[PDB]
Amino acid sequence: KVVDRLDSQPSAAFEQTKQVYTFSRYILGPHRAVVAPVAMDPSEKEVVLRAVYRQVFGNAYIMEEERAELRVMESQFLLGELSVKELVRALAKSSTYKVRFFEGAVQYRFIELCFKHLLGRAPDNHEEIAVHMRKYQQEGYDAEIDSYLDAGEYDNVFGDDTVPFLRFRGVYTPCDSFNRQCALQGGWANSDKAMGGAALSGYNGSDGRQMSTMIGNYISGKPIPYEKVAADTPLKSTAPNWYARPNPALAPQPAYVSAKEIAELRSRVSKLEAAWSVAVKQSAAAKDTVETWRAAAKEMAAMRGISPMGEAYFGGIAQKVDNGALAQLGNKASSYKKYLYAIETDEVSRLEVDLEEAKGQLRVLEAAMAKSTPMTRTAE
Amino acid sequence: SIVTKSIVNADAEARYLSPGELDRIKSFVLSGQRRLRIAQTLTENRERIVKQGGQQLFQRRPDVVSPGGNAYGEEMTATCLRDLDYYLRLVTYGIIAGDVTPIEEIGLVGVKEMYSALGTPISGVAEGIRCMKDVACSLLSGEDAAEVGFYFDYTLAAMQ
Amino acid sequence: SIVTKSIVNADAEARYLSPGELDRIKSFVLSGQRRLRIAQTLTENRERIVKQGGQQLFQRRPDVVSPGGNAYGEEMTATCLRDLDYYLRLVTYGIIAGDVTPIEEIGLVGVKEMYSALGTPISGVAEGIRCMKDVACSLLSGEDAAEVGFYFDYTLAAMQ
Amino acid sequence: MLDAFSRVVVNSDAKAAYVGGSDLQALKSFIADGNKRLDAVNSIVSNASCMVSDAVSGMICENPGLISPGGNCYTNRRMAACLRDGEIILRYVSYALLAGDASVLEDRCLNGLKETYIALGVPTNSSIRAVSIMKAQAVAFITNTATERKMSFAAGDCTSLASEVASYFDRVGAAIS
Amino acid sequence: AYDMDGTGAGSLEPRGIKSSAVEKDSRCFKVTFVLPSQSRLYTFRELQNVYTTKMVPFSSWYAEQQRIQKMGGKILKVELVAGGQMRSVGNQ
Amino acid sequence: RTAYPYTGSGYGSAGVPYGQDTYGYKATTAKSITETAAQAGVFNTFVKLLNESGVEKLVEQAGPYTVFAPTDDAFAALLEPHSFNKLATLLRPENNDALRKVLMHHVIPGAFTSASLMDRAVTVKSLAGE
Amino acid sequence: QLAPPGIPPGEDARNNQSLRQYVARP
Amino acid sequence: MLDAFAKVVAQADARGEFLSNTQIDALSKMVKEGNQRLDIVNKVTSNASAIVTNSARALFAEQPQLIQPGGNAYTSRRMAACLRDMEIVLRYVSYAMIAGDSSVLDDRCLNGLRETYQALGTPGSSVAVAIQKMKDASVALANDTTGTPIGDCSSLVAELAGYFDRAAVSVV
Amino acid sequence: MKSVITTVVSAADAAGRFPSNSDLESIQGNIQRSAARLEAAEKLAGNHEAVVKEAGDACFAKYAYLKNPGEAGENQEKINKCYRDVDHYMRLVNYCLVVGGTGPLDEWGIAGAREVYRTLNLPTSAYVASIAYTRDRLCVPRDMSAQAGVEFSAYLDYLINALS
Ligand SMILES: *CC[C@H]1/C(=C/c2[nH]c(/C=C3N=C(/C=C4\NC(=O)C(CC)=C4C)C(C)=C\3CCC(=O)O)c(CCC(=O)O)c2C)NC(=O)[C@@H]1C
Ligand SMILES: *[C@@H](C)[C@H]1/C(=C/C2=NC(=C\c3[nH]c(C[C@H]4NC(=O)C(C=C)=C4C)c(C)c3CCC(=O)O)/C(CCC(=O)O)=C2C)NC(=O)[C@@H]1C
Ligand SMILES: *[C@@H](C)[C@H]1/C(=C/C2=NC(=C\c3[nH]c(C[C@H]4NC(=O)C(C=C)=C4C)c(C)c3CCC(=O)O)/C(CCC(=O)O)=C2C)NC(=O)[C@@H]1C
Ligand SMILES: *[C@@H](C)[C@H]1/C(=C/C2=NC(=C\c3[nH]c(C[C@H]4NC(=O)C(C=C)=C4C)c(C)c3CCC(=O)O)/C(CCC(=O)O)=C2C)NC(=O)[C@@H]1C
Ligand SMILES: *[C@H](C)[C@H]1/C(=C/C2=NC(=C\c3[nH]c(C[C@H]4NC(=O)C(C=C)=C4C)c(C)c3CCC(=O)O)/C(CCC(=O)O)=C2C)NC(=O)[C@@H]1C
Ligand SMILES: *[C@H](C)[C@H]1/C(=C/C2=NC(=C\c3[nH]c(C[C@H]4NC(=O)C(C=C)=C4C)c(C)c3CCC(=O)O)/C(CCC(=O)O)=C2C)NC(=O)[C@@H]1C
Ligand SMILES: *[C@H](C)[C@H]1/C(=C/C2=NC(=C\c3[nH]c(C[C@H]4NC(=O)C(C=C)=C4C)c(C)c3CCC(=O)O)/C(CCC(=O)O)=C2C)NC(=O)[C@@H]1C
Ligand SMILES: C=CC1=C(C)[C@@H](Cc2[nH]c(/C=C3N=C(/C=C4\NC(=O)[C@H](C)[C@H]4CC)C(C)=C\3CCC(=O)O)c(CCC(=O)O)c2C)NC1=O
Ligand SMILES: C=CC1=C(C)[C@@H](Cc2[nH]c(/C=C3N=C(/C=C4\NC(=O)[C@H](C)[C@H]4CC)C(C)=C\3CCC(=O)O)c(CCC(=O)O)c2C)NC1=O
Ligand SMILES: CCC1=C(C)/C(=C/C2=NC(=C\c3[nH]c(/C=C4\NC(=O)[C@H](C)[C@H]4CC)c(C)c3CCC(=O)O)/C(CCC(=O)O)=C2C)NC1=O
Ligand SMILES: CCC1=C(C)/C(=C/C2=NC(=C\c3[nH]c(/C=C4\NC(=O)[C@H](C)[C@H]4CC)c(C)c3CCC(=O)O)/C(CCC(=O)O)=C2C)NC1=O
Ligand SMILES: CCC1=C(C)/C(=C/C2=NC(=C\c3[nH]c(/C=C4\NC(=O)[C@H](C)[C@H]4CC)c(C)c3CCC(=O)O)/C(CCC(=O)O)=C2C)NC1=O
C-alpha cells in the first residue's frame, strides 16, 4: 500500500499538501498550488491575479488596452466577495475569452482548452468529451462553464481559493492521459494562440482559426507520439536536473542521415537485447565467486570473542579488536561503497545502459529517415 | 598444452617438427585417458580439499584469522576459501594440459603485485597451497600423487 | 651524489655542464651546513630510533616475533633490528649526498631477490622503516623533519 | 505583510515624514541585534518537531478526557490533526519572530482561526493549554535553559527576544480564546 | 649532443644523415610502410613480416624515412602523434 | 558465456584475437580534414574558401583541432537581410585578411567530442584569437 | 635601511617641506 | 614609536588632509584581521625560550668554530651574551608585530647594533644566521592550527618574516 | 534546488521583474555565510568514512534486535546496505552545505522516503539514532569552527525533524 488517497478526493484533516503530490513532479517545478490567504495586502493580491491570468488564459498576453474589460471583475475580486473559483467563472464567461478560445475554434479544441484551463486535466476519455459537447448544443455557452466547475471534481481538487494548476497527479486513470497533459501544456514559452494556429491563419494576428491537432486520438484510442511528450513539455519546465544514465531528452533530428548507419545501429540493438536475455538468466545464482564458501567460512569464524574491546593478545602484544557491526564481519568502508559503482562495473547493468543509449539514437535516426525525394546526401 | 609449447619451439627454428618432438605428442595423447581420471577425482573432492586444506592453514598461521589479520571476519575467510578454490581449479587444468603454463598465465604472473596491493601475506597463500597438496595427494595413489605433486610444488616456488 | 649525476648525464651527450646544471651544484654546496647537521642529529639517536622503531613494528606486526614468524627468538630479533640499522645508516648517507642514490646503490638494487631468498617478508621490512620514520621525524624541526621523511618514504616505495 | 523596517515607514507616512536621524535609531538597534535574532530563530526551528509532541502530549496528561470516546483527540485521524495544527501555529509564530512584527501571524494564521474551531468543535480551553506549553519551551530554548538540550552560542543575553516571542504566543492565546 | 653542431663536408666525422632535433627531443610520428627484403634469395634467412606500422621518434624519422626509400620500400602514411607544430621552445 | 569478452591468445583467454583482429596498433584509415570534408560533398563552399584564403595550411597540421565547418546550406543562409550587411563586403577581391579572421574562428584547438560536451559549458579561444 | 641617527622613524619634520625652503640634512 | 594606525595619521598631517574613505577601509580591515594578529604574538612569546635555545643549539652545530677556544662565543659570559642578544631581537620583533610597524624595532634595537658588533669583533654574518634561524622557527610556529580556528593568515606571516629580515640586514 | 539564488529568481519570475535591489542584497548574505558552511563541507568530505562507521554501529548497538533472522539486518548484504544509507544521508548533507539551502535533501533524500520505508519495513527510528548520534558527537571547537558547527548541526537537525 503506497498511496492512500488520490488527488481526485478531498484532502484529509491531517496533511498540509496531498500525499500523491509529495513525490510527483509537483514539487519540482512551477505547477504548484497558489492559495489566497485570509487577509490580503494589495501587493499580494497581484501575486494571485498574475497567476490566474497565466492559467486561465494559457500564457496569452493581455495588453493593457484589453485588460480594461476586466477591471469590473478584477475589483470584485480585490474587494473580496468573488473567490478564485468565482473569478474564473466570470473570466471564462468574458468577451476576451470567447474571442480567443471560442469564436474560431472547432468544438473539440474548445473543450480540450476548457479542460486545460478550468481543470488541471487533459480530456480523459471520449464519452466525457461527448457529454460536454452535449450541453452546449442544448444549453448554450452559459451553463457549460458550470459543468466543469459545479461538479465534484473542482471542489475536491482546487476548493474555492486555489488557482488552477496543471496537476501532476501521480495516478493516471488511463496512462495515455499523462501524454495528453504534456501535449497540451507544451512548453513554458508556448501559448494556445501558437499551438492552435490562431495567428498564422488570420489577418495581422486577428481572425484566427483555433484548430486542433490530435483530434483522432480522442475518438480512436491511440497514444501520443513520444516526441510531443519529451521535447516541448512540462517535463522540461519541471526537469529534475538529475544525473540520469538513460537521459530522456530528445536529441535534435540530424541533417545527413544514411541508411548504412541505421542498419548497423538496428543490428547492434539485437546483439545487445539478446545478450541481455542470456545474462539476466545467468545471474541470481552463480554470479558470486565468494558465495558457495560463505556457509563454510561462517562456521569457521564463530569463536575467540573479546567482550571488553582490546583482547586477542596473540602472545603478550596487544591487538585492538573493534566490536562494530560492520567490522565484526570483516568489512571496510569500501564494502558499502561498491554499490555506488555498479553502473560501469556490473555486466547486467552495462548491457541495459548500452542498449538504451542505442534505442535513443535509433529512435531519432529512423525518424529523420522519414524524409524524401530531393535529399542531398553525404560521405559520412 | 605441450602440443602448443612443442610447435612454438619448432617455428622458432623455422623447421618441421623433429622425429623426437612428434614422439612427445603421441606419448602425451596416449596418456589422455589417464589424466582425465586423475583431474576428475580431484574435482569430486573440492569441499573436502579446500575446507580441510583451509582449516589446517588456520592452525599453522593463526594470525591471518585473528584481529588485525587479513582474513579476519566472516567475509575475509569466505574470500579466503575463494582463492583456494581458484588454485585447485587451475591445478586440474595443468594436469589435463601436461604443462604448468595454464597455472602460470592464470594466477602466477603478476601474483606478487595483486596480493601486495591487497595487503595479503604471500607466504600465507603458499601455506594454504602446501596444505591443499597433502589433502589432495592423500586421496590419490603414490603413482598419481607424485605426478600431481609437481603442479602444487611449482606454484609454491613462483609464489615466493 | 648530485654532482655525480650531473657529470655522468653530461658525459652521455659528450659536452660540458650548462649553467642550469651548475646552479644545482652551487645550490647544493650551500646547503651543506644544514645537511651535515641533520645527519649528525640522526647519528646521535641510533639506539633510540632503532629500538623505538623495532618496538612499534612488533605491535603492528605481532606475528613476525611469535612462534613461527621469521624473527622468532632473541638471536633472530637481534638480526631483525640489525637490518633497521642498515637502512638508518643508508638514510644518513642520502641526506649528506644530496640525493637517494646511496640508498639505491646500497640496499635497494635486488632487495626483493635478497629478502625472498632469506624467507623474510619484504612487507615487514617496509613496515619497520615506516615506524623508524615517525621516531626520527619527532626529533627534528618543522622543515628539517619534512625532507628527512622524504628519504624514508623513498625507501618504502622502492621496497614494495 | 510587514516587517520591522516597513512598520517605521508606514508610521512615518500618515504623518508624511521622511525617515530621518531620530527614527533610524530603533532600526540600527535592529540591524545590530540581527545575529541574535537568527540565533534565536535557528534555535526554534531546529527543535520544531519535538516541541509540538512535547506540547500535545502535555495537553493529554493533564486532561484525560481528550482521548475518551468522542473526545477531540480520539481516533488516529483526530490525534494526527492536533499534531498538524500545532506545527502550523509554531510555524507562523516563528515567521513573526524572524521578521520582527506579528503582522504575518495575525492576518494569515490568526485571522479567522477562532471561528474555524467553533465550526469544527475543537475545544478552545484545551488548545490554549497547548500554546502555553509551547510558550514555555520557546522561551527555554532562546535563553539556553532547556534542561535536556544545550545548543552552543556565544555568551550574552537574549531576554528581549525571549519576551518578544512570549507576546507572540499570547496573541495566539488571545485570538482563539 | 644534437645532430646539427656544424658537421658537414670536410670534417673528421663521416658524412651521414643530420636531424633537426634538439637534445632529448620528444616528438614522435606514426608511420606505415611496406619494405621487401630484396636479398632473401641469396641469404636464405627466415621469412619476416614487411608490413609495418610503428611510432618512430622525430630524431630518427629523417634517417628511417630515408632508409626505407633506398631499400625499395614504400611509405603509405605518416602522422605526428606527439609534439607541437612550429613550437619555438618546448620540444625537449 | 559473457557480454564483453577480452582479447588475447593462449591460456586464460576468451577466444577473441588481440585487438579483435590480432592488430594491437592499427593503422589510420581516416583522412585529412581538408579531404574528409571534400569527400562528404556538403562542405563544398567551406573547403573552397580554405584554399582561396590560405587557411588550408593550418587545417592540415597535426594539431588536434575541433572544426565547426558550416554546411553548404549555412553559407547559402547568409542572404538574410541582417547577416548580409555584415559579410557582403567580404565578397570584394581585396578583403582577404577579413575572410581569414572569419574562417579561423571555426578551428578550435583540442578534440572536443559531442559526448564530452554533454551537460558541460566550455569556453576556449579560437585560432583567430577570440 | 634605518633612519639617520637620532631621528625618530616615521616622525621626520622635512616630510612635506617645500623646495624653496628645504634644508639639506647633514 | 608609532603603530600602523598612527603611521597613517602622521603622513596625513604633513599634507594637512583628512583621511579619505579608501584609507579608513584599509584601517577597518586591519581591525578585521585583529584577533589573527594577537594569535601570532601569543604563539611567539609562549615559546620564546624554545625559539632561542633551539636556534642557538643549531647554530654552533653548523659553525663549531664559534665555541672553540678562540671563538667569539667561548666562555660562560660570552655564551650568555650570545643568547641575550637573540632574546632582545626576538622581543622587539614581537613589538613590531603587535604594532604593525617596524618603528619600535629600529628606534631602540637596531640603531648602532651594526657598529657595536664591529667594535667587539663579533662576526655579524653569523649573527644574521641566528636571526634567520629564529625566523623560520617562529614562522613555522605561526601557521600551525593547534587551538586556533582554520583560516588564512598568509599576509600576516609574510609581515612577520619582513621584520626578521629587516633585523638581519641591519646587523651586518 | 532550494538555494538563495533560486528563491529570488523564481519569486521574481513569478512577478515578471528583473533582478531587483532586494535580490542582490540577499546574494550578499550568501557571500558572508559562505566560508562558514564551506568549512564544514570540507570537514565532511575528508573525514566521512570515519563518521559513517561510527554512526552506523550506533544503530546496531542501540537496536541489536535487527541482526535477528527476520529483521532488516539478517545477513551481511543488508548490513552493508545499511551503512550505505548513512553514507547517502551524510553525502546529501555535504551537498546541502555546498548549495546553501535544503535543495538536495528535499528532492533526493526526503521526497518519498515516508513511502519506501513503510513497504520495505525499514524502521525509521534506526535511521534517526544514527543521525542524532553524529549531532551529539560534534565537539564544536575541535571538529570545526563554532559557526561551522551551527551550519553543520542545522541540516543534521533538519533531517531528524523530517524523519521524525
Ligand atoms: C649568538 C649571538 C652572536 C654573538 C653575540 C654577542 N654579543 C655580545 C655583546 C654585546 N651585545 C650587545 C647588544 C645590544 N646592546 C643593546 O643595547 C641592544 C638593544 C639596542 C643589543 C641587541 C652589547 C652592548 C654587547 C657588549 C656588552 C656585553 O657584554 O653585554 C657578545 C660578547 C662580546 C664580548 O666580547 O663580550 C657576544 C658573544 N656573538 C656571536 O658569536 C654570535 C654569532
Ligand atoms: C540568544 C538567543 C543566545 C545568544 C545569541 C547570540 N548570538 C550571537 C552571535 C551570532 N550568532 C550567529 C549565527 C547567526 N548569524 C547568521 O548569519 C546565521 C545564519 C545564517 C545565524 C544563526 C553569528 C554568526 C554570530 C556572531 C558571532 C560569531 O561570529 O559566531 C551573540 C553575540 C552578539 C552579536 O555578535 O551580535 C549573542 C549574544 N547567545 C546566548 O548566550 C543566548 C543563549
Ligand atoms: C593564524 C595565526 C592562525 C589562525 C588565526 C585565526 N584566529 C581567528 C580568531 C581568534 N583568534 C583569537 C586569538 C587572539 N585574540 C585575542 O583576543 C587574544 C587574547 C587576548 C588572542 C591570542 C581569538 C580569541 C579568536 C576568536 C574570535 C572569534 O571567533 O570571535 C580567526 C578567524 C575565525 C574564523 O574565521 O574561523 C583566524 C583565521 N587561524 C589559522 O588557521 C592560523 C593557524
Ligand atoms: C541500516 C542502518 C538501516 C537499513 C537500511 C536498509 N536500506 C535498505 C534499502 C534501501 N534504502 C533506500 C534509501 C537510500 N537509497 C538512496 O539512494 C538514498 C538517498 C540518496 C537513501 C536513503 C532505498 C531506495 C532502498 C531500496 C534499494 C536498495 O537496496 O538500496 C535495505 C534493504 C532492505 C531489503 O532489501 O528488504 C536495508 C537493510 N536497515 C536498517 O535496519 C537500518 C534502518
Ligand atoms: C518502477 C517499477 C519502474 C520505474 C518507475 C517510475 N515511474 C515514474 C513516474 C511515472 N510512473 C508512471 C506509471 C504509473 N502511473 C500511473 O498513473 C499509471 C496509470 C494510470 C502507471 C502505470 C507514470 C504515468 C509516471 C509519470 C507521472 C508523474 O511523474 O507524476 C518515475 C519517476 C521518474 C521521474 O521522477 O522523472 C519512476 C522512477 N522506474 C524504474 O526504474 C522501474 C523500472
Ligand atoms: C490540536 C492541538 C487541537 C485539535 C485540532 C484539530 N483540527 C482539526 C481540523 C482543522 N484544523 C485546522 C487548523 C489549522 N489549519 C490551518 O489552515 C491553520 C492556520 C493557517 C490551522 C491552525 C483547520 C482549518 C481544520 C479543518 C479543515 C482541515 O482539516 O483541513 C481536527 C479534525 C476534526 C475532525 O476530524 O472532525 C482536529 C482534531 N483538536 C483538538 O482537540 C486539539 C485542541
Ligand atoms: C617622480 C617621478 C620622481 C620622484 C621625486 C621624489 N621627490 C621626493 C621628495 C621631495 N621632492 C621635492 C621637490 C618637490 N617639492 C616642491 O616644492 C617642488 C616644486 C615646487 C617639488 C618638485 C622635495 C623638496 C622633496 C623632499 C622633501 C619631502 O620629503 O617632501 C621623494 C621622496 C624622497 C624621500 O623621501 O627620500 C621622491 C621619491 N620620485 C621618483 O621616484 C622619481 C625619481
Ligand atoms: C503528562 C505529560 C507531561 C509531559 C510530556 C511534560 C511536557 C512539558 N514539558 C515542559 C517543559 C519543557 N518541555 C520541553 C520540550 C522538550 N524538551 C526537549 O529538549 C525536547 C526538544 C522536547 C521533548 C521532545 C522543554 C525544552 C522544556 C523546558 C525545560 C527543559 O526541558 O530543559 C512543560 C511546561 C513547564 C513545566 O511543566 O515545567 C510541560 C507541560 N510535562 C508533563 O506533565
Ligand atoms: C564531520 C565532523 C566530525 C566530528 C564531530 C568528529 C566526530 C569524531 N570525534 C572523534 C573523537 C573525539 N571527539 C572528542 C570530543 C569530545 N569528547 C568528549 O568527551 C567531549 C564532550 C567532546 C569535546 C567536544 C574526543 C576527546 C575524541 C577522542 C576520544 C574519542 O574518540 O572519544 C572521532 C574518532 C576519530 C577522531 O579522533 O577524529 C570522530 C569520528 N569527526 C568528524 O569528522
Ligand atoms: C585464479 C587467479 C586469481 C586469484 C588467486 C585471485 C584473488 C583475489 N583475492 C582477492 C581478495 C582477498 N584474498 C584474501 C586472501 C588471503 N587471506 C589470507 O589470510 C591468506 C594469506 C590468503 C589466502 C586465503 C583476502 C582476505 C581477500 C579480501 C581482501 C579484502 O576484502 O580487502 C580479490 C579481490 C576480491 C575478489 O575476489 O574479486 C581477488 C580478485 N584472483 C584471481 O584471478
Ligand atoms: C645495506 C642493505 C642490506 C640489508 C637490508 C641486508 C640484510 C640481511 N638480512 C639478513 C638476515 C635476516 N633478516 C631478518 C629480517 C627481518 N625479520 C623480520 O621479522 C622483519 C620483517 C625483517 C626486518 C627487520 C631476519 C630474521 C634475518 C635472519 C634470518 C635467519 O637467521 O633465518 C642477512 C643474513 C645475515 C647477515 O649477513 O646479517 C643479510 C645479509 N644486507 C644488506 O647489505
Ligand atoms: C630527400 C627527400 C627528403 C626530404 C626533402 C625530407 C625532409 C624532412 N624535412 C623535415 C623538416 C623540416 N623541413 C623544413 C623545411 C622548410 N622550411 C621552410 O620554410 C621551407 C619552405 C622549407 C625549406 C625549403 C623545416 C623548417 C623543418 C622542421 C620542422 C619543425 O621542426 O617543425 C623532416 C623531419 C625530420 C627533421 O627535420 O630532421 C624530414 C624528414 N626527407 C626526405 O627523405
Tell me the C-alpha distance between H141 and C142, whole Å.
8
Tell me the C-alpha distance between A122 and A115, whole Å.
6
- How far is the CA of B22 from the CAs of B6, B28, B94, D1, I29, in angstroms? 9, 10, 21, 102, 87
On whether B80 is known to bind a ligand per the annotation, the reply is yes
Write out the three cell numbers for E31: 608511420
Which chain C residues are within 8 Å of E23, Cβ to Cβ? Answer: 13
Write out the three cell numbers for C121: 617478508
State the Cα torsion F120-F123-F128-F129 to the nearest 10°: -170
Residue of I nearest to D49 (CA): I161
DSSP state of A27: G
- Between the CA of G3 and the centroid of ligand 1 the distance, in Å, is 22
In single-letter form, the type of residue at position A262 comes to: I
CB neighbours of D18 closer than 8 A, spacing ≥ 6? D12
- Between the CA of A114 and the centroid of ligand 5 the distance, in Å, is 27
Which chain A residues are within 8 Å of C61, Cβ to Cβ? Answer: none
Stated length of chain H: 172
Write out the three cell numbers for F75: 553559407
Q: Whose CA is nearest to atom 42 of ligand 8?
A: D58
Tell me the C-alpha distance between B100 and B40, whole Å.
18
Structural domain total, chain I:
1
Residue E51 sits at φ, ψ, to 5 deg, of -100, 110
Tell me the C-alpha distance between A231 and H158, whole Å.
58
Rounded CA Rg of chain H:
18
DSSP state of F26: P
Cβ D47 vs Cβ D139: under 8 Å: no
Tell me the C-alpha distance between C10 and H152, whole Å.
45
Cβ B75 vs Cβ B117: under 8 Å: no
I149 and D152 in contact by Cβ < 8 A?
Answer: yes
A38 lines ligand 6 (CB under 6 A): no
Residue of C122, C72, C57, C62 lying closest to B67 (CA atoms)? C62
Elucidation method: cryo-EM
Which chain B residues are within 8 Å of A294, Cβ to Cβ? Answer: 74, 78
Domain that holds residue I18: 1-164
Tell me the C-alpha distance between A54 and A62, whole Å.
10
Q: Tell me the domains of chain D and their CATH numbers.
A: 1-177 (1.10.490.20)
- Specify binding-site residues of D: 50, 61, 82, 158
In single-letter form, the type of residue at position D174 comes to: A
- How far is the CA of I23 from the CAs of D95, I11, I36, in angstroms? 20, 10, 22
Left (φ > 0), alpha (ψ -120 to 50) or beta: where does A80 sit? left
Residue of A48, B97, H140 lying closest to C141 (CA atoms)? H140
**Chains touching chain D, criterion 3+ CB pairs below 8 Å:** A, I
Left (φ > 0), alpha (ψ -120 to 50) or beta: where does B68 sit? left
F29/E contact by beta carbon, under 8 A: no
Write out the three cell numbers for A345: 562495473
Cβ E54 vs Cβ F25: under 8 Å: yes
Cβ I131 vs Cβ I54: under 8 Å: no
Cβ A197 vs Cβ A210: under 8 Å: yes
Other beta carbons within 10 Å of H105: 26
Write out the three cell numbers for A107: 468544438
Cβ F33 vs Cβ F60: under 8 Å: yes
Tell me the C-alpha distance between F72 and F35, whole Å.
16
Cβ B149 vs Cβ B137: under 8 Å: yes
Write out the three cell numbers for C77: 630479533
- Specify binding-site residues of C for (2R,3E)-phycocyanobilin: 70, 80
Residue of D24, D23, D137, D124 lying closest to D90 (CA atoms)? D137
Residues after which chain D is discontinuous, using a C–N cutoff of 2.5 Å: none
- Taking CA F29 as the corner, what is the angle to CA F28 and CA F32, rounded to the nearest 5 degrees? 85
Cβ I10 vs Cβ I23: under 8 Å: no
HSE at residue A357, side-chain half, CA atoms within 13 A, is 11
Tell me the C-alpha distance between A67 and A196, whole Å.
22
- Between the CA of D157 and the centroid of ligand 3 the distance, in Å, is 23
H140 and C142 in contact by Cβ < 8 A?
Answer: yes
With helix as H, strand as E and coil as C, how does chain H read? CCCHHHHHHHHHHCCCCCCCHHHHHHHHHHHHHCHHHHHHHHHHHHCHHHHHHHHHHCHHHHCHHHCCCCCCCCCHHHHHHHHHHHHHHHHHHHHHHHHCCCHHHHHHCCCCHHHHHHHHCCCHHHHHHHHHHHHHHHHCCCCCCCCCCCCCCHHHHHHHHHHHHHHHHCCC
G21 lines ligand 7 (CB under 6 A): no
State the angle between helix axes of F44-53 and F96-103 in degrees (0 to 180), rounded to the nearest 10: 130
Cβ C97 vs Cβ C3: under 8 Å: no
Collect all residues from C whose CB is shorter than 8 A from any CB in H: 33-34, 36-37, 40-41, 141-143
CB neighbours of B34 closer than 8 A, spacing ≥ 6? none
Determine the 3-state secondary structure of A164 from DSSP: coil
Query: What stretch of H or E contains D38?
Result: helix D34-45
Determine the 3-state secondary structure of A167 from DSSP: coil
Tell me the C-alpha distance between B93 and H141, whole Å.
65
DSSP state of C119: T
Q: Whose CA is nearest to atom 1 of ligand 9?
A: I44
- Order of strands across the sheet that contains E28-34: E51-54, E28-34, E74-82
C58/A contact by beta carbon, under 8 A: yes
Q: Look at strands E51-54 and E28-34 and give their pairing.
A: antiparallel
Tell me the C-alpha distance between B90 and B102, whole Å.
7
Determine the 3-state secondary structure of F7 from DSSP: strand
Q: Which of G7, G12, G18, G23 to mutate to test the pocket of ligand 7 (most atoms within 8 A of CB)?
A: G18
Cβ A95 vs Cβ A126: under 8 Å: no
Stated length of chain G: 26
DSSP bridge pairs for A203? A206
With helix as H, strand as E and coil as C, how does F33-85 read? HHHHHHHHCCCHHHHHHHHHHCCHHHHCCCCCEEECCCCHHHHHHHHCHHHHH
Residue of I nearest to D41 (CA): I154
Tell me the C-alpha distance between A108 and C91, whole Å.
90
Residue of H105, H109, H103, H112 lying closest to H1 (CA atoms)? H103
Find residues 231-270 of chain A whose CB sits inside 8 Å of chain I. Answer: 240-241
Tell me the C-alpha distance between E31 and E54, whole Å.
6
Tell me the C-alpha distance between I164 and I151, whole Å.
20
Tell me the C-alpha distance between D173 and E19, whole Å.
96
Write out the three cell numbers for A130: 461527448
**Residue H14: nearest ligand to its CA?**
7
Query: What stretch of H or E contains C111?
Result: helix C111-117
- How far is the CA of D71 from the CAs of A15, C76, D65, in angstroms? 20, 84, 6
CATH number of the domain to which I36 belongs: 1.10.490.20
Tell me the C-alpha distance between A276 and A270, whole Å.
10
Residue of H81, H86, H85 lying closest to H51 (CA atoms)? H86
Sign of the dihedral defined by the CA atoms of residues A100, A106, A110, A112, in that order: negative
DSSP state of F18: G
Tell me the C-alpha distance between C159 and C120, whole Å.
13
D130 CA: nearest ligand 6 atom? 2
D136 lines ligand 8 (CB under 6 A): yes
Tell me the C-alpha distance between H52 and H85, whole Å.
10
Q: Where are the alpha helices (H) located in chain B, listed in sequence order?
A: 2-13, 19-30, 32-43, 46-55, 57-60, 74-97, 101-105, 111-118, 122-138, 142-158
Tell me the C-alpha distance between A223 and A215, whole Å.
12
Query: What stretch of H or E contains I131?
Result: helix I125-136
Q: Tell me the resolution in Å.
A: 2.8
Query: What stretch of H or E contains F107?
Result: strand F107-109
F3 and A350 in contact by Cβ < 8 A?
Answer: yes
Q: Where are the alpha helices (H) located in A84-190, listed in sequence order?
A: 84-92, 96-101, 107-117, 126-149, 152-157, 177-184
Cβ A208 vs Cβ A197: under 8 Å: yes
Tell me the C-alpha distance between F71 and B72, whole Å.
66
Tell me the C-alpha distance between A186 and A192, whole Å.
9
Tell me the C-alpha distance between C88 and C148, whole Å.
11
Nearest by CB to residue C121, choosing from B60, B61, B123, is B123
With helix as H, strand as E and coil as C, how does chain E read? CCCCCCCCCCCCCCCCCCCCCCCCCCCEEEEEEECCCCCHHHHCCCCCCCEEEECCEHHHHHHHHHHHHHCCCEEEEEEEEECCCCCCCCCC
CB neighbours of D172 closer than 8 A, spacing ≥ 6? D89, D93, D105, D109, D110, D131
- Between the CA of F113 and the centroid of ligand 10 the distance, in Å, is 39
**Residue I53: nearest ligand to its CA?**
9
Cβ D138 vs Cβ D51: under 8 Å: yes
Tell me the C-alpha distance between F72 and E4, whole Å.
48
Tell me the C-alpha distance between B156 and I80, whole Å.
36
- Between the CA of C82 and the centroid of ligand 8 the distance, in Å, is 68
- Between the CA of D32 and the centroid of ligand 2 the distance, in Å, is 11
I5/A contact by beta carbon, under 8 A: no
D51 lines ligand 6 (CB under 6 A): no
Tell me the C-alpha distance between C60 and A319, whole Å.
9
Cβ D169 vs Cβ D128: under 8 Å: no
**Residue D145: nearest ligand to its CA?**
8
Determine the 3-state secondary structure of A35 from DSSP: strand
Distance from CA of F26 to the nearest CA of E (A): 7
Q: Which of I26, I147, I157 to mutate to test the pocket of ligand 2 (most atoms within 8 A of CB)?
A: I147
Q: Whose CA is nearest to atom 17 of ligand 1?
A: H109
Write out the three cell numbers for C42: 640522526
Cβ D51 vs Cβ D134: under 8 Å: yes
